């Protein structure tokens, strides 16, 4: 699809057998989902933004579907207000910026 | 252009006569630049992101040039880790997400 930026570019994702809304975020290296009980091994991570850092759990090799497009990779899970689709997965779905 | 996301979508901007590098950030409602001097009146404001809320200076109707494209809009200055072009200006240069 083509998503304009008048509004926050929110999409539906499928992850860990759940449907969810997430932000397509060219400003994010990584993918950060709101607290959820993913099964799987994980390691602790700190990630930064505007106001400091939060601790998240890193899960590797996690299959995910973004608006019908399948991908698989690292997902961080922590106390983010918004589901964030970062570049690691945006490249997998063929997403670009165009102007 | 078309811009892929294997690397951070970083661009040169011209603001206030000065060149800087900035990240094209579809996950930001607003444009927030590192500490710098800008001419005009500014209002104190707060914004938030991952890691919490920061204090910023708000400049309205600032012209900025982004990869040769002209915008004039609100620009925020403060302790952001990176110069960030948000949707307020990305809409002005006709930026979309495509996949």
């Amino acid at each position: 699809p083509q998503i304009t930026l008048w509004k926050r570019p929110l999409v539906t994702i499928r992850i860990g057998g759940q449907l969810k809304e997430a932000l397509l975020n060219t400003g994010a290296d990584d993918t950060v989902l709101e607290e959820m009980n993913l099964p799987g091994k994980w390691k602790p991570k700190m990630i930064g933004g505007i106001g400091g850092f939060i601790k998240v759990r890193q899960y590797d090799q996690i299959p995910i579907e973004i608006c019908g497009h399948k991908a698989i990779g690292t997902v961080l899970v922590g106390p983010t207000p918004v589901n964030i689709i970062g570049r690691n997965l945006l490249t997998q779905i063929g997403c670009t910026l165009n102007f | 252009p078309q811009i892929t996301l294997w690397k951070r979508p970083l661009v040169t901007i011209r603001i206030g006569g000065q060149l800087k590098e900035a990240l094209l950030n579809t996950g930001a409602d607003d444009t927030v630049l590192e500490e710098m001097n800008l001419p005009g009146k500014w209002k104190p404001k707060m914004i938030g992101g991952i890691g919490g809320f920061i204090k910023v200076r708000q400049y309205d109707q600032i012209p900025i040039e982004i990869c040769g494209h002209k915008a004039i809009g609100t620009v925020l200055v403060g302790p952001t880790p990176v110069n960030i072009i948000g949707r307020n200006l990305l809409t002005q240069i006709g930026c979309t997400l495509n996949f």
Binding site: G49, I84, G86 | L23, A28, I47, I50
Partner: peptide, 8 residues
């Protein structure tokens, strides 16, 4: 407003 720069 809200600004979701993520540094990984």
């Amino acid at each position: 407003a809200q600004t979701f720069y993520v540094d990984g």
